[PDB]
Amino acid sequence: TQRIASHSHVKGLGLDESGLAKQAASGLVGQENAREACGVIVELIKSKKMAGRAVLLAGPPGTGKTALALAIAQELGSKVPFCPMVGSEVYSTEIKKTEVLMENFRRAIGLRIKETKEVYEGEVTELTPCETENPMGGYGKTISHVIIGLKTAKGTKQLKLDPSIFESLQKERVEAGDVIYIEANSGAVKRQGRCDTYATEFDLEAEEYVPLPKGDVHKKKEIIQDVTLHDLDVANARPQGGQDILSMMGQLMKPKKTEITDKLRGEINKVVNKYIDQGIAELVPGVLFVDEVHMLDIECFTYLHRALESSIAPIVIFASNRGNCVIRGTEDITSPHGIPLDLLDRVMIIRTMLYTPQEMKQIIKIRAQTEGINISEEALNHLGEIGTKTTLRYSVQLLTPANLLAKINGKDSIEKEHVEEISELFYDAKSSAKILADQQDKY
Amino acid sequence: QRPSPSGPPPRCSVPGCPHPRRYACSRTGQALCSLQCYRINLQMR
Amino acid sequence: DVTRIERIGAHSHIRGLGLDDALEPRQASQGMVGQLAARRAAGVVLEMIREGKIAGRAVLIAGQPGTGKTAIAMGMAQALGPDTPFTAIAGSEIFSLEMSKTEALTQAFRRSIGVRIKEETEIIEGEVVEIQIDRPATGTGSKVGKLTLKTTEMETIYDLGTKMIESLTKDKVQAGDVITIDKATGKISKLGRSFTRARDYDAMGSQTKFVQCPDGELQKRKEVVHTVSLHEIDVINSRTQGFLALFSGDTGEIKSEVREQINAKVAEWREEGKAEIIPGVLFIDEVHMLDIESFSFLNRALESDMAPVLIMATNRGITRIRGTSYQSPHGIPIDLLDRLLIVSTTPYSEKDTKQILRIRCEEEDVEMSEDAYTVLTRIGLETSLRYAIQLITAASLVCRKRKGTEVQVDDIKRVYSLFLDESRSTQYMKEYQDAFLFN
Amino acid sequence: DVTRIERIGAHSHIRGLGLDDALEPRQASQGMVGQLAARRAAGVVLEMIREGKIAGRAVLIAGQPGTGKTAIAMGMAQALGPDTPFTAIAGSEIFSLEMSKTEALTQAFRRSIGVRIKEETEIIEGEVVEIQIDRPSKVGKLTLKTTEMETIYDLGTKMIESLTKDKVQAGDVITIDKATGKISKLGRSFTRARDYDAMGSQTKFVQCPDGELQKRKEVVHTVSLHEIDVINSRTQGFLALFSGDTGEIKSEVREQINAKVAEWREEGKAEIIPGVLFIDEVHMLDIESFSFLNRALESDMAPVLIMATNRGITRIRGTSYQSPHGIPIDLLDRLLIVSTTPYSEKDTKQILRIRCEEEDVEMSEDAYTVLTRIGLETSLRYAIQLITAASLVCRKRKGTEVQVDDIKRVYSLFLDESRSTQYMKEYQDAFLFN
Ligand SMILES: Nc1ncnc2c1ncn2[C@@H]1O[C@H](COP(=O)(O)OP(=O)(O)O)[C@@H](O)[C@H]1O
Ligand SMILES: Nc1ncnc2c1ncn2[C@@H]1O[C@H](COP(=O)(O)OP(=O)(O)O)[C@@H](O)[C@H]1O
Ligand SMILES: Nc1ncnc2c1ncn2[C@@H]1O[C@H](COP(=O)(O)OP(=O)(O)O)[C@@H](O)[C@H]1O
Ligand SMILES: [Zn+2]
């Protein structure tokens, strides 16, 4: 069974047809205005019109700003890319920060392109170079084509192939008893190995045998693949070929990220524009979620400045939980959320408030039920009171150890004694800080 | 061309054992499967 | 319905500077309104750059936040044209772990001076009828063949040497194909298979698209125009068979001797009349972020005879320069500050803010009532213009949610209540002093 | 007499966590004394780890120096035992020069998640005796020999070619996997180690294989997720597993690894076993790295973090802010602090006894009394270290039992922190730099 995470219950915002926020739906309670704003943002993302618009979820720690981003991701679906990030990913020892940011920005934009695969594959039986019976002046014969018999688990059939393919057949080891495959579009031939049927004619053979193919000899299907715009960058930056001393040399050396030049993007954009205009590929913009933005640098913010007004950048959702803090990279330039004011004028701020005890108890119950835990009301109320005394996280965290203690005692549900014992055992931040202050002389 | 295949795969020489031939013995030269059938063939000869 | 890679951004409505033949800015043209003096100066410098005779000229644009400095930059970039190189670099796009700051600035400078080359070649576009290959038995590896080409009017037979045969085999060209042959270099570009020749076919050995037959004469002339920056010429000549560094960006701290060699060779190329050198424009935005060493390198690098017309941008006041402790205007030392002209921008008013909102709505295809426009302008005067611009899309979405067609004051008030401003967020922020982190 | 690579350390006298069936600690069991509440919490979180149902859980152990945070962590590791990954690192181990602090923590996270897989293996292994070929498709046979049988295989042409290229000779012990057909020479038999009086560049003499020849069975493989990441990091990445040459693995590979692992667990092919990541002296991590743990503990697959901290209210490294435990508040709430308590005099006697029997040292009762007095007036670790020197000084006296005089002599010879500091101030001018 899939293991329980810390945000497993969040399945959506839980909105009406009119956009109003339900009191409790899809694992979310409260924060009605925030949920309505997030629904508006979801509509904006689905609109496929804007670009580079940013929203900043601002609120105290443990108020659900991280959860709402995942709710937006869930309500978006899975056909639109959603790239998470923390503020500490920019600091790399291999490449500059504004390239980490540019690569991530290009990650949140995905493609979706369709194509057909056609192949003739199966076991080879005989090779008949069918001749035309009347050689030409100055020659003893005139081979017309090659007849190749291929059999799979369905049936056997003969195919007429160009004579030149024989020149490729001798390039590899094409003997009867092997299984081969030829790409219809490409036209090359490749050998997989001898069939399993002849796996017993010897006691020790150096080659490994593959099973006989099941299905029709000639397969043809249609496949749609999705690639982000960053994958094209890496593919074009590092050509993966083997017939070079450069390709192979780089493929032997330690791979390192390289600062992609803006000229490469200028041509990838042109080619994807051409193919979109030809109706082959469909572009789908996505979302990029930066949590703990307050860990960025002033250089990173100043690059984000220019990055946002681009006509290609995706929708960015920032999250932070800092008060009036000093901006990283400066000396004493304080600012709200640790974010410069000039950048902060380009974002739409969504405020997240605290949680009332009723909503806290509802959250505790939802977590307990999603987790597969049974709790009594006289203990659930005590747990909610304890959480309201300290915080929501400290109340939700004690669910599992209480269940383990009850199961050790044999009971199938948590009572008052289990909760009080667990609370007596573990400590919270406030009491630990009080102890540290009391015993400061011995640390 | 297609060389003619064989119908039944070779079997362990001991009539009781129905396993296929993993290998052939050296001292006496018969098909064998494992330790037990090797010991049986050694004893019965 | 289809969505291209280019979407509607923050400066997607500005299509130019909106100036007449007399270089007198208009009140409202080409997506730009107001800011008459800055637009005038920008038109002057645009005409100056278009003339392209003096080098190493710098211009700084200063003013309040959100007063169109970047808007002016994008406007002059659009007015300049696509064929004139323009490079936009942020203030932090030079602090790299792969090359020094001076090296990055040198690459940025050399990336702006373009070279235009017209390349005319003789080509043969035609349909393949049959191909003749006569492999030797033993001999010494000499191959001989013939190749017949046909169009809807004329046809011919060509002989083959020992060089194009290997190319034809590598590209795997057979009958029923339409190919373009480059007479100079010798490359074979594949167009596609024909229609009539596809009737006689073996099993699928090539499945792809379809094309027609090149009409007219078999032999023609093709012309390409290449715009190559100096920096990529430097990268090409810095190592043998090194071309992925144009895209990979792996070349670091190129040797100077290569740079002077390229400068000299470009000089002779200009003299011979083969290629044409065209200076471009470099736009460094938020340039207060540059370390003092970068500024002082700019000092000397701006005195060369191949420097571009760099354009600055800053919204800071009397601030200490990055990396130092000395105050100075615009966070820039006086040395660099004494070598360029400074263009200042004025804060906006109500009359032109309303027109900004109107043109933004026209770009975004959003309709509001006149009362809604007045409320939005009041918001965009009590609060910055960017917030009012942003609220337009949210109001349009909210209006479309209720199956509406015209945005109303109630929708705008709802959006104002839903999202937040920096001032209101800070006001609500003071009441949770102990709830936040590190106050 | 014979000393192995491992010997008596500081935490080697503890073997598991002393508990009961009802998770009730004992006064003195499995080399642990006291810390009843801390051991109860440790047992609860150990059961939580063993169940492995919830992901992303953090526990912090705090207390004064010399109270046994690291001892509790090692006891937990021993009680958990092998077969469950347990990655123990120090706080300062992530300050690398080839990878950022993010990668050095991401890899430390992926190295505490185990994957159990089952494989069907058939392998032949034995000493070759004679190889015969003919020259007519060359046909031949080869003979294997073990302690039980002696057998002949009628191998094919490709096997002939492989054997010729590998240059197999009689007396060699070789293994072949019939599934693929790869020869893995192990060396030469002991009985074949005399026909050459000048051995080549590299040869090894190993005993002839015993038992049945062609063994077919099922094996279990427990591989960490970090290994699966490194293997797909580059073309030949398994070298980096031992070299340590890996750096900044692309994020488009770890997601694929996670998706494939989820698909495998859905198919039942492989099973995921969570583990523990112990980060000792976590009080010295970067504010940038602390913020990374915020989103690292909220993933579907993540180990249980256990941290130790010796700091009270102190400055955070990387910023000019005062916080408890040197840890930001936005992370401390995600944790679950388990506090410790300074030991009493009875605990001090009962803890010096265990080390004495660990070092195989007999001590007198008055010697124990004096040692307990010293270890109460001074640090416990100093008193613990005072027994090893005492044994050697008593051995120099040619006595089998230590006494009070020996303890006093060893106390007078070496110095503790207090006396060193006191004597240091007497002639502080002679010292350098204050
Ligand atoms: N609206 C909500 N409904 C249900 N649970 C919530 C809600 N908001 C927060 N939580 C719970 O609070 C816990 C921590 O919230 P989090 O998103 O980490 O807050 P922050 O982002 O401020 O740190 C999560 O485990 C989540 O389950
Ligand atoms: N004169 C103008 N004409 C049209 N739009 C303008 C003008 N001035 C400002 N704007 C709009 O204001 C928005 C913010 O301006 P911005 O580029 O941030 O100014 P600055 O870069 O000086 O802070 C831009 O999206 C732009 O469309
Ligand atoms: N509960 C205990 N039982 C037995 N020995 C202990 C216990 N706690 C600590 N010790 C011993 O005390 C010595 C020092 O304790 P240590 O773990 O270094 O303290 P801290 O946790 O402050 O680092 C260790 O060598 C350890 O073996
Ligand atoms: Zn048998």
Swiss-Prot record, chain A:
<dbReference type="GO" id="GO:0000812">
    <property type="term" value="C:Swr1 complex"/>
</dbReference>
<dbReference type="GO" id="GO:0007283">
    <property type="term" value="P:spermatogenesis"/>
</dbReference>
<dbReference type="GO" id="GO:0005654">
    <property type="term" value="C:nucleoplasm"/>
</dbReference>
<dbReference type="GO" id="GO:0000492">
    <property type="term" value="P:box C/D snoRNP assembly"/>
</dbReference>
<dbReference type="GO" id="GO:0016887">
    <property type="term" value="F:ATP hydrolysis activity"/>
</dbReference>
<feature type="cross-link" description="Glycyl lysine isopeptide (Lys-Gly) (interchain with G-Cter in SUMO1); alternate">
    <location>
        <position position="214"/>
    </location>
</feature>
<dbReference type="GO" id="GO:0101031">
    <property type="term" value="C:protein folding chaperone complex"/>
</dbReference>
<dbReference type="GO" id="GO:0017025">
    <property type="term" value="F:TBP-class protein binding"/>
</dbReference>
<dbReference type="GO" id="GO:0042981">
    <property type="term" value="P:regulation of apoptotic process"/>
</dbReference>
<dbReference type="GO" id="GO:0097255">
    <property type="term" value="C:R2TP complex"/>
</dbReference>
<dbReference type="GO" id="GO:0045995">
    <property type="term" value="P:regulation of embryonic development"/>
</dbReference>
<keyword id="KW-0227">DNA damage</keyword>
UniProtKB/Swiss-Prot annotation, chain B:
<comment type="function">
    <text>Induces growth and cell cycle arrests at the G1 phase of the cell cycle.</text>
</comment>
<feature type="zinc finger region" description="HIT-type">
    <location>
        <begin position="8"/>
        <end position="39"/>
    </location>
</feature>
<protein>
    <recommendedName>
        <fullName>INO80 complex subunit B</fullName>
    </recommendedName>
</protein>
<comment type="subunit">
    <text>Component of the chromatin remodeling INO80 complex; specifically part of a complex module associated with the helicase ATP-binding and the helicase C-terminal domain of INO80. Interacts with RP9.</text>
</comment>
<comment type="function">
    <text>Proposed core component of the chromatin remodeling INO80 complex which is involved in transcriptional regulation, DNA replication and probably DNA repair.</text>
</comment>
From Swiss-Prot, chain C:
<comment type="similarity">
    <text>Belongs to the RuvB family.</text>
</comment>
<dbReference type="GO" id="GO:0000791">
    <property type="term" value="C:euchromatin"/>
</dbReference>
<dbReference type="GO" id="GO:0005524">
    <property type="term" value="F:ATP binding"/>
</dbReference>
<keyword id="KW-0547">Nucleotide-binding</keyword>
<dbReference type="GO" id="GO:0071392">
    <property type="term" value="P:cellular response to estradiol stimulus"/>
</dbReference>
<dbReference type="GO" id="GO:0003678">
    <property type="term" value="F:DNA helicase activity"/>
</dbReference>
<dbReference type="GO" id="GO:1990904">
    <property type="term" value="C:ribonucleoprotein complex"/>
</dbReference>
<dbReference type="GO" id="GO:0000492">
    <property type="term" value="P:box C/D snoRNP assembly"/>
</dbReference>
<comment type="function">
    <text>Possesses single-stranded DNA-stimulated ATPase and ATP-dependent DNA helicase (5' to 3') activity; hexamerization is thought to be critical for ATP hydrolysis and adjacent subunits in the ring-like structure contribute to the ATPase activity. Component of the NuA4 histone acetyltransferase complex which is involved in transcriptional activation of select genes principally by acetylation of nucleosomal histones H4 and H2A. This modification may both alter nucleosome -DNA interactions and promote interaction of the modified histones with other proteins which positively regulate transcription.</text>
</comment>
<dbReference type="GO" id="GO:0006338">
    <property type="term" value="P:chromatin remodeling"/>
</dbReference>
<dbReference type="GO" id="GO:0042981">
    <property type="term" value="P:regulation of apoptotic process"/>
</dbReference>
<keyword id="KW-0010">Activator</keyword>
Curated annotation (Swiss-Prot), chain D:
<dbReference type="GO" id="GO:0005654">
    <property type="term" value="C:nucleoplasm"/>
</dbReference>
<dbReference type="GO" id="GO:1904507">
    <property type="term" value="P:positive regulation of telomere maintenance in response to DNA damage"/>
</dbReference>
<comment type="similarity">
    <text>Belongs to the RuvB family.</text>
</comment>
<dbReference type="GO" id="GO:0043531">
    <property type="term" value="F:ADP binding"/>
</dbReference>
<feature type="modified residue" description="Phosphoserine">
    <location>
        <position position="418"/>
    </location>
</feature>
<dbReference type="GO" id="GO:0003678">
    <property type="term" value="F:DNA helicase activity"/>
</dbReference>
<dbReference type="GO" id="GO:0006357">
    <property type="term" value="P:regulation of transcription by RNA polymerase II"/>
</dbReference>
<dbReference type="GO" id="GO:0016020">
    <property type="term" value="C:membrane"/>
</dbReference>
<dbReference type="GO" id="GO:0006338">
    <property type="term" value="P:chromatin remodeling"/>
</dbReference>
<dbReference type="Pfam" id="PF06068">
    <property type="entry name" value="TIP49"/>
</dbReference>
<dbReference type="GO" id="GO:0036064">
    <property type="term" value="C:ciliary basal body"/>
</dbReference>
<keyword id="KW-0963">Cytoplasm</keyword>
